[PDB]
Scaffold this active site. Structure first.
Site, mmCIF file in Angstrom:
data_model
loop_
_atom_site.group_PDB
_atom_site.id
_atom_site.type_symbol
_atom_site.label_atom_id
_atom_site.label_comp_id
_atom_site.label_asym_id
_atom_site.label_seq_id
_atom_site.Cartn_x
_atom_site.Cartn_y
_atom_site.Cartn_z
ATOM 1 C CE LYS A 299 -2.377 -2.191 3.398
ATOM 2 N NZ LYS A 299 -0.892 -2.139 3.469
ATOM 3 C CD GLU B 241 0.284 2.723 7.857
ATOM 4 O OE1 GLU B 241 1.420 2.190 7.471
ATOM 5 O OE2 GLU B 241 -0.332 1.902 9.120
ATOM 6 N NE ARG B 242 5.190 -0.634 9.886
ATOM 7 C CZ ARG B 242 4.644 -0.819 8.877
ATOM 8 N NH1 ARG B 242 4.531 0.179 8.214
ATOM 9 N NH2 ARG B 242 4.197 -1.928 8.639
HETATM 10 N N1 LIG Z 1 7.044 -3.120 -5.978
HETATM 11 C C1 LIG Z 1 7.575 -3.789 -5.020
HETATM 12 N N2 LIG Z 1 8.709 -4.362 -5.233
HETATM 13 C C2 LIG Z 1 9.309 -5.132 -4.457
HETATM 14 N N3 LIG Z 1 9.063 -5.234 -2.981
HETATM 15 C C3 LIG Z 1 7.690 -4.674 -2.784
HETATM 16 C C4 LIG Z 1 7.290 -3.938 -3.729
HETATM 17 N N4 LIG Z 1 6.150 -3.496 -2.945
HETATM 18 C C5 LIG Z 1 5.952 -4.078 -1.569
HETATM 19 N N5 LIG Z 1 7.172 -4.761 -1.458
HETATM 20 C C6 LIG Z 1 7.480 -5.581 -0.219
HETATM 21 O O1 LIG Z 1 6.351 -5.740 0.602
HETATM 22 C C7 LIG Z 1 6.542 -4.708 1.541
HETATM 23 C C8 LIG Z 1 5.058 -4.219 1.947
HETATM 24 O O2 LIG Z 1 4.683 -3.262 1.354
HETATM 25 P P1 LIG Z 1 4.786 -1.727 1.995
HETATM 26 O O3 LIG Z 1 5.907 -1.243 2.564
HETATM 27 O O4 LIG Z 1 3.951 -0.641 1.244
HETATM 28 O O5 LIG Z 1 3.758 -2.055 3.514
HETATM 29 P P2 LIG Z 1 2.300 -1.965 3.300
HETATM 30 O O6 LIG Z 1 2.045 -3.216 2.308
HETATM 31 O O7 LIG Z 1 2.082 -0.362 3.134
HETATM 32 O O8 LIG Z 1 1.842 -2.559 4.709
HETATM 33 P P3 LIG Z 1 1.370 -1.299 5.640
HETATM 34 O O9 LIG Z 1 0.009 -1.086 5.411
HETATM 35 O O10 LIG Z 1 1.749 -1.927 7.086
HETATM 36 O O11 LIG Z 1 2.308 0.131 5.509
HETATM 37 C C9 LIG Z 1 7.541 -3.524 1.335
HETATM 38 O O12 LIG Z 1 7.972 -2.892 2.305
HETATM 39 C C10 LIG Z 1 8.557 -4.518 0.480
HETATM 40 O O13 LIG Z 1 8.924 -5.280 1.579
HETATM 41 MG MG LIG Z 2 0.558 0.781 4.805
#
Ligand SMILES: Nc1ncnc2c1ncn2[C@@H]1O[C@H](COP(=O)(O)OP(=O)(O)OP(=O)(O)O)[C@@H](O)[C@H]1O
Ligand SMILES: [Mg+2]
Ligand SMILES: Nc1ncnc2c1ncn2[C@@H]1O[C@H](COP(=O)(O)OP(=O)(O)O)[C@@H](O)[C@H]1O
Ligand SMILES: [Mg+2]
Lengths: 85, 55, 458, 85, 460
Positions: free
Chosen positions: C154, C180-181
């Site tokens: 996200k 968020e963090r």
């Molecule tokens: N396009 C990408 N390429 C490679 N790795 C990815 C990609 N998108 C996400 N990831 C991996 O998955 C993780 C999770 O996505 P993100 O950092 O956005 O957290 P999130 O899904 O937003 O969760 P939260 O809602 O807790 O922030 C990324 O930090 C990375 O570790």
């Molecule tokens: Mg997030």
């Protein structure tokens, strides 16, 4: 008449009912939610020409009137089992 | 040649049905996790409506 | 002039004289030892009692503290002076810089624009991302939502959209951090300052460590700044870091306010609280807000009432899924659930529309084949069902793309793909002009050229 | 810092929360269960030298402190999609 | 004089207070003037001193606190007997057909005890429907109860209309129709159907429609049953048709919540089994006369497993379950032979001829259902020759269970058919033993008689 999301109407009536502290029911909907939709949809009728003459005091003779309803409901993942659907 | 191809068919159907039986059992073990999780959630939700339904 | 008379968690009850009782949403103030605490009025109870949510730590309150009645809502700094600075929910400066030199302050509680004032636009906004503006293209002045469970991309997607949209956007931008963090917020602030783009961004943070009243109202503070830049007649970007946390902070307080629980234990007023925020983040005949919102879905459950009511408020919805992220395919967008109001033959043209419906039709048909493939394997498929499965797997891999913010993870260089170039690629795969390349050639490549080049390297 | 089972903390808070009759949510935990684990873990941080100087009244210059946290969660049957996980 | 006052109004539930000497009894009836309009209340509870909790038998809108209330010292009493034939009435037994006063000579109370154990009768006189699947798989007696179980849109109303045509015209006696939570359109369609059939003068109608307040929908079933009990006690044999029993239980659920009863499983009222039992036990045939009953029951979501369908199954002698699966596949009637049965399907009475034919059909169709799943995996290629005969017989038997109805010619254009019991035995046994697989599968479908089935194959 097209009622868009009668499901939204029910959620508004649930909010009102719980804020008035009435006894909650299934999925926390008020018990009388069936009577909400039932007394609305039963207004959609075709009425005979004698009712139209009696109502219009004879100004319109020999024509039936009609009201047609198309309510719209949204089901979460298709489950017809939910209380409002 | 025909009789060898018929024996090759029976041995190929044998190994295919082995793989099908194992893939069916492996799908049973996933559907039962879905079912048990839905079982537990339905008990919790209905008993929450009952207890929160009184008073 | 009033006294604290009960203290339950984050909720504080105050007694006032009968002639002096506060209005709803007025701000009260308390000395909490050496601290100052603000209380926001939620309800008027009988007899001059008034019930309030603490905009800070509730610890260390006694009964019988004197409360002072400030006779106005929470009001925040607004306008051009708010730009490049970090603020509290209360509009206080939180960076170590000085006072905010604001000329004007606005109340954070406002009505939405009249139906007569709304405005509509078909203008496509182009993005670097193959799947997003193939499957769910979105327009200047419209709303976008990214749905997903925990840890599925996200934030990474929103950070790519910040990069790519800010290429062609000139005006100011607002970022609301709701739940968020903090580490993210600090990384983003240093990214913005080290690239000197900070001079055009206004940031509001009420991160997840702060008590419920902050997290509830900080979303509204972010909107109130974006509504000023809109009413100055500009066009504006608003990014909201996780809008789910607003409804959850409402759930954490609701039972203490003395309200019977609804549905899965949510507040009974859930649909009104969500609507009364979402309806003021809109464009208008004077100016336009373009907004991207992240929407966490709890336990991956896309049918929970909070996700379910959020889907109705958005123009473009992109739905991430854990099953695709687990296969390595990023961005983990699900083409069979992601959609847009803008995917119309009239808006995008027939070739785009027809390519998008072709991709959906193939990928749906591949889902219909997975149960027989699971039980019997692929050799029992029909001879063109094998061809559908081979094209669908190639399409699945060609939706994947390298991101410039993911170099810290992939290490691979990032890619920007224009609309014309992506629809040509997908159309060519569907016509089968690439049906001789292997699947691995399509993984993490920007454009079709790069796939044939990668197939030359195997 | 290692927290040996945050799932066992949530169960204990669920016990206390339900003994105080607080209306339960998903899997019977309260909504405060996010706030419980949020405010705990969000203290595991790294801080810049201006914070360390201001905190320690200047007795330590230019160093930066950190707290590193490895929480443990036990999950049923490997289900990574349950609520507290 | 009027001796009590309204003290609360919360939706349909009105609380009334009286002096401590003259508190109305349970199920008594009270009358108040709501604006220009006389409203009846029915007493559900005596709670505390002098207060009673009541349900409004009409719209609650416009009631004030402090209105005077009069205690009519009796239950709701309705006109019964010969003066009700050809008339439509509401729950209160007032005339809603606009033909004037009922002109009754007697009024009875809608609340009464059931017949005593000593007074019941046993007789097994086989009634005949002319509907293949019912007369084969679930034959009726006289004096028994018939449940038509189905979800939304599966043919309960079409089957009840065809059963009304077949049974009533031949009945040569009175009948009662009770519309409980019935669509007003369908109530007008039935009334016009009965007068165009010129049979209306042997039927009494009670209607409580969907739009009516919960109290009306709750008590209408007792009004119609009280008329049927009057004709029974005169010594007659009568038909009672009840157009959905589910909405009696459901009106009780809406009521129960605000009566302050603590909820039960699935949100139902605690009293569900008691409320159902107090209704169903009155509907019997005694040593003095016979009530024959046909009841539709709505099963929510096709679940068949929630308390209201579960409790109602116990009371009925004949059970016909109508299935969304067969209805959706487009075969009518949608009666599931694997879940439908009657206690008259006893070798002794029906004779071995009928019993062994029925059990033979049932055993084939269960064997087909077991094969049907693995047929998708195996086709018919890897099925055996023993399977191929059984499936052939099963499919053609399952076509021969269809029939066109005189009611349903509107939907279908094809004329209605009638089939006698002996003939349908002869036809099913004919595929059972004669095994006339000479004929295409559609030759068995929607034909009716065995002769027409072969003639259809002779034509194609
Ligand atoms: N396009 C990408 N390429 C490679 N790795 C990815 C990609 N998108 C996400 N990831 C991996 O998955 C993780 C999770 O996505 P993100 O950092 O956005 O957290 P999130 O899904 O937003 O969760 P939260 O809602 O807790 O922030 C990324 O930090 C990375 O570790
Ligand atoms: Mg997030
Ligand atoms: N014997 C039949 N022939 C044709 N259509 C039928 C038959 N039985 C039921 N249907 C169809 O079922 C629908 C009406 O069923 P009905 O009994 O009125 O619904 P419900 O059982 O929910 O009251 C219509 O689509 C009607 O055509
Ligand atoms: Mg019906």
């Amino acid at each position: 008449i097209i009622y868009d999301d009668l499901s939204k109407q029910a959620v508004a009536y649930r909010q009102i009912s719980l804020l008035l502290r009435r006894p909650p029911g299934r999925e926390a909907f008020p018990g009388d939610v069936f009577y909400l939709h039932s007394r609305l949809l039963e207004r959609a009728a075709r009425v005979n020409a004698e009712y139209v003459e009696a109502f219009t005091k004879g100004e319109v003779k020999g024509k039936t009137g009609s009201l047609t309803a198309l309510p719209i409901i949204e089901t979460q993942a298709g489950d017809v089992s939910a209380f409002v659907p | 040649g025909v009789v060898e191809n018929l024996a090759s068919e029976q041995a190929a159907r044998m190994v295919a049905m082995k793989a099908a039986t194992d893939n069916g059992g492996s799908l049973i073990k996933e559907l039962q996790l879905v079912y048990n999780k839905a079982r537990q959630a339905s008990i919790t939700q209905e008993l929450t409506e009952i207890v929160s339904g009184a008073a | 002039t009033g006294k604290i008379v009960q203290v339950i968690g984050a909720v504080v009850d105050v007694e006032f004289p009968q002639d002096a009782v506060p209005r709803v949403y007025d701000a009260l103030e308390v000395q909490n030892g050496n601290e100052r605490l603000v209380l926001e009025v939620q309800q008027q109870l009988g007899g001059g009692i008034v019930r309030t949510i603490a905009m800070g730590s509730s610890d260390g309150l006694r009964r019988g503290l004197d409360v002072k009645d400030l006779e106005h809502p929470i009001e925040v700094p607004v306008g051009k002076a708010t730009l490049g600075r970090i603020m509290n929910v209360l509009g206080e400066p939180v960076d170590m810089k000085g006072e905010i030199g604001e000329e004007e302050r606005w109340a954070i509680h406002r009505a939405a624009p009249s139906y007569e004032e709304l405005s509509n636009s078909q203008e496509l906004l182009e993005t670097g991302i193959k799947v997003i503006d193939l499957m769910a293209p979105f327009a200047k002045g419209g709303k976008v939502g990214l749905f997903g469970g925990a840890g599925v991309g996200k934030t990474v997607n929103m950070m790519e959209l910040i990069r790519n949209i800010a290429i062609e956007h000139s005006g100011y931008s607002v970022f609301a951090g709701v739940g968020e963090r903090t580490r993210e917020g600090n990384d983003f602030y240093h990214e913005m300052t080290d690239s000197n783009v900070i001079d055009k961004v206004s940031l509001v943070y009420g991160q997840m460590n702060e008590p419920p009243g902050n997290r509830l109202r900080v979303a509204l503070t972010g909107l109130t700044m974006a509504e000023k830049f809109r009413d100055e007649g500009r066009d504006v970007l608003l990014f909201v870091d996780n809008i789910y946390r607003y409804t959850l902070a409402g759930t954490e307080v609701s039972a203490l306010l003395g309200r019977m629980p609804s549905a899965v234990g949510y507040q009974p007023t859930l649909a009104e609280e969500m609507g009364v925020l979402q309806e003021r983040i809109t464009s208008t005949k004077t100016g336009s807000i373009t907004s991207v919102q992240a929407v966490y879905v709890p336990a991956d459950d896309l049918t929970d009432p909070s996700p379910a009511t959020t889907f109705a408020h958005l123009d473009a919805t992109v739905v991430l899924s854990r099953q695709i992220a687990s296969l390595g395919i990023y961005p983990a967008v699900d083409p069979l659930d992601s959609t847009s109001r803008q995917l119309d033959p009239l808006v995008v043209g027939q070739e785009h529309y027809d390519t998008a419906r072709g991709v959906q039709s193939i990928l749906q048909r591949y889902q219909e084949l997975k149960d027989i493939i699971a039980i019997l394997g692929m050799d029992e498929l029909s001879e063109e069902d094998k061809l559908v499965v081979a094209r669908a797997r190639k399409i699945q891999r060609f939706l994947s793309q390298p991101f410039f913010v993911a170099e810290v993870f992939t290490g691979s260089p990032g890619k920007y793909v224009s609309l014309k170039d992506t629809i040509r690629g997908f159309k060519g795969i569907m016509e089968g002009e690439y049906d001789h390349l292997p699947e691995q050639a399509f993984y993490m490549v920007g454009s079709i050229e790069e796939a044939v080049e990668k197939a030359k390297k195997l």
